Design an enzyme around this catalytic site. Structure first.
Site, mmCIF file in Angstrom:
data_model
loop_
_atom_site.group_PDB
_atom_site.id
_atom_site.type_symbol
_atom_site.label_atom_id
_atom_site.label_comp_id
_atom_site.label_asym_id
_atom_site.label_seq_id
_atom_site.Cartn_x
_atom_site.Cartn_y
_atom_site.Cartn_z
ATOM 1 N N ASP A 172 0.010 -8.496 0.650
ATOM 2 C CA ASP A 172 0.498 -7.113 0.647
ATOM 3 C C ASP A 172 2.025 -7.047 0.615
ATOM 4 O OD1 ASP A 172 -1.960 -5.883 0.498
ATOM 5 O OD2 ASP A 172 -2.173 -5.660 2.671
ATOM 6 N N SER A 212 5.855 2.084 8.570
ATOM 7 C CA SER A 212 5.661 0.685 8.220
ATOM 8 C C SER A 212 6.899 0.127 7.531
ATOM 9 C CB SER A 212 4.442 0.530 7.312
ATOM 10 O OG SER A 212 4.499 1.444 6.233
ATOM 11 N N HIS A 244 0.799 -1.219 0.000
ATOM 12 C CA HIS A 244 0.000 0.000 0.000
ATOM 13 C C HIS A 244 0.835 1.274 0.000
ATOM 14 C CE1 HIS A 244 -0.112 0.024 4.727
ATOM 15 N NE2 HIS A 244 1.100 -0.161 4.237
#
EC number: 3.4.21.90
Lengths: 151, 151
Positions: free
Chosen positions: A51, A103, A29
């Site tokens: 992901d 992240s 993302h």
């Protein structure tokens, strides 16, 4: 310390990329491109089930990759912002540490071996539960607690 | 020390030959003739899949033979030009040590047992990775990383 690279878009930092074993890993993302000139020309695979994206490590950059393992006994682990606790098969961090844009930080054992990559987290008063991706023998797996929100 | 003989071609040294167990071994891509008079009269067998040649040791020279094993735990190992580390299934040495013409050296254990024979290797920035021929229970195997070059 040296194996982490920054991903930038329009002068802003949104996330990180890491070198593990013989593959490069990056959250799905997170938008933008890689600052390093050589790595930005690689072709990637994409998977919306986990992901993750990956690519093959170039020859001359192999010496910088870290070690990895798959044993996860109970105990304490470390990352950039301090100590992290593992008990009951779940990752927990003291509240308030960590903000959006962080992240992709690896989580290390006592000897410096990589076990997970963090992406997002859950909200709770006293202690915060994390959203993590790990691996096992010959597979990858995703663990997501209830109510998690992306970082 | 005593188990190694030199192979020469037109006055130039090209490699080495070792006496392991009850067999005489030599890499295939090395040309020339063995210096010792007795070994030069033997017959050899060839196999281009493993890049090896072998022949059976004569009777009276067996007293010089070395011991050998197949156990390969993680740790540290040594050879002529220094110490070598084995971890993750690969052998690595400090960069810049080792030059073409040294192929065929044994790799020794803590108690003097032979575990490997080196032929070629791949070179990157801070480290180098070797291409080695080893054995197991009842067969022999070849290991080669990307970009390796002969020595």
């Amino acid at each position: 310390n040296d194996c982490i690279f920054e991903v930038k878009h329009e002068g802003k930092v949104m996330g990180y990329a890491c070198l593990v074993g013989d593959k490069v890993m990056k959250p799905a993302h997170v938008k933008g491109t890689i600052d390093n000139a050589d790595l930005a020309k690689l072709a990637f695979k994409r998977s919306s089930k986990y992901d993750l994206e990956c690519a093959q490590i170039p020859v001359h950059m192999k010496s910088d990759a870290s070690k990895f393992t798959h044993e996860k006994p109970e105990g304490y682990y470390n990352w950039h912002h301090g100590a992290v606790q593992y008990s009951g098969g779940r990752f927990t961090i003291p509240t308030g540490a960590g903000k959006p844009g962080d992240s992709g930080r690896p989580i290390f054992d006592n000897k410096g071996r990589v076990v997970a990559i963090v992406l997002g987290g859950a909200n709770e008063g006293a202690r915060t539960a994390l959203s993590v991706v790990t691996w096992n023998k010959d597979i990858v797996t995703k663990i997501t607690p209830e109510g998690a929100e992306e970082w």
